[PDB]
Design a protein around this ligand. Structure first.
Ligand SMILES: [Cl-]
Ligand SMILES: [Mn+2]
Length: 342
């Protein structure tokens, strides 16, 4: 509990009390039970609640994360969970993923039934996230599984869960799900690619960190930018090992051909705006402002500005790109985007 409690800071005291009541209930239902690792079962729903609390999930969602296995793993409490934690917690813990039927919106344009549509959908999204948080944690703790069972769940994850994560637009979940699945599915391919990156990545890492520090300090020191900004993040390339190995087979490319240009990402969280439009305006103003700061810092390579804010990819991808001449006279790609954008 002392590990979970700090992550629940974003919730109102009464919302946190519901989560403690849920933890203390799971603590009872899972009393005596053990995982594959000799660890007590309660550690699993806690870790799942931690994943959800890190994502700043709804109070009922975090609570439902502590109770998601009180029906499956140990005991039956369908009317008990409704009696103790409400119907919405009971609904999430019961499984109702239904199916992707967004194409039904397009054909059906035509209230209390359209109001309930939102509350049913948002409840249906919450079900998927808990399943995802659960699966992500299991994969993390997959070292205590026979090497066959390990391969059956990595494939299920790649067929079912990583695509569900994609539907929900949870790229950070999808990334980790794919890469942990890759590790256990083809370990020999994983260890070959991992150690190969740990050769180029260490040499690159010195420059990437110099660049990171230079961009982070340049942005924090700009007065006007920080005024319309809540915060920012300057990272190196993300390194999606499954989507990197996936591309090597498709494109018939070497890994040396992928890392053929040092890259840096700038994720900007702007200050909140009263209306939806004054937010979209703020969201873009900030991005070109960074492009200017970047071009003032490092020399821009002619015709390497890729504006995907103005011309988004068919999947809706927005971001500003520019290849510059940075440290040691090297072509460095910069990608400027907000938290909302991908
Ligand atoms: Cl600020
Ligand atoms: Mn579970």
């Amino acid at each position: 509990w002392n590990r979970l409690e700090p992550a629940l800071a974003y919730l109102a005291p009464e919302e946190r009390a519901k989560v403690r009541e849920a933890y203390r209930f799971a603590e009872e239902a899972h009393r005596g039970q053990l995982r594959r690792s000799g660890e007590p079962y309660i550690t699993h729903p806690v870790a799942v609640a931690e994943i959800l609390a890190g994502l700043q999930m709804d109070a009922d969602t975090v609570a439902a994360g502590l109770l998601h296995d009180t029906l499956e793993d140990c005991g039956v409490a369908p009317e008990e969970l409704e009696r103790r934690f409400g119907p919405t917690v009971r609904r999430i813990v019961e499984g109702e993923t239904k199916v992707s039927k967004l194409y039904k919106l397009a054909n059906l344009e035509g209230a209390e039934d359209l109001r309930q549509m939102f509350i049913a959908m948002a409840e249906d999204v919450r079900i998927i996230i808990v399943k995802l948080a659960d699966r992500l944690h299991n994969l993390r703790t997959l070292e205590h599984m026979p090497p066959e069972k390990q391969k059956r769940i990595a494939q299920e994850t790649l067929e079912i869960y990583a695509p569900l994560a994609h539907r929900l637009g949870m790229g950070q979940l999808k990334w980790e799900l794919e890469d942990l699945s890759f590790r256990y599915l083809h370990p020999e391919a994983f260890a070959s690619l991992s150690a190969r990156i740990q050769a180029t990545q260490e040499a690159r890492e010195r420059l990437i960190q110099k660049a990171i520090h230079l961009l982070q300090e340049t942005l924090a020191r700009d007065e006007l930018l920080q005024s319309q900004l809540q915060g920012f993040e300057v990272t190196g390339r993300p390194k999606h090992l499954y989507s990197i190995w996936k591309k090597m087979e498709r494109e018939g490319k070497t890994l040396e051909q992928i890392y053929d240009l040092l890259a840096v990402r700038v994720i900007l969280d702007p200050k909140p705006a009263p209306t939806r439009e004054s937010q979209a305006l703020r969201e873009k103003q900030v991005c070109y402002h960074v492009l200017g700061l970047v071009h003032a810092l490092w020399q821009p390579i002619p015709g390497r500005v890729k504006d995907y804010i103005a011309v988004p990819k068919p999947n809706g991808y927005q971001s500003l790109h520019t290849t510059v001449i940075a440290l040691e006279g090297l072509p460095l790609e910069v990608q400027i985007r907000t938290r909302e954008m991908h």
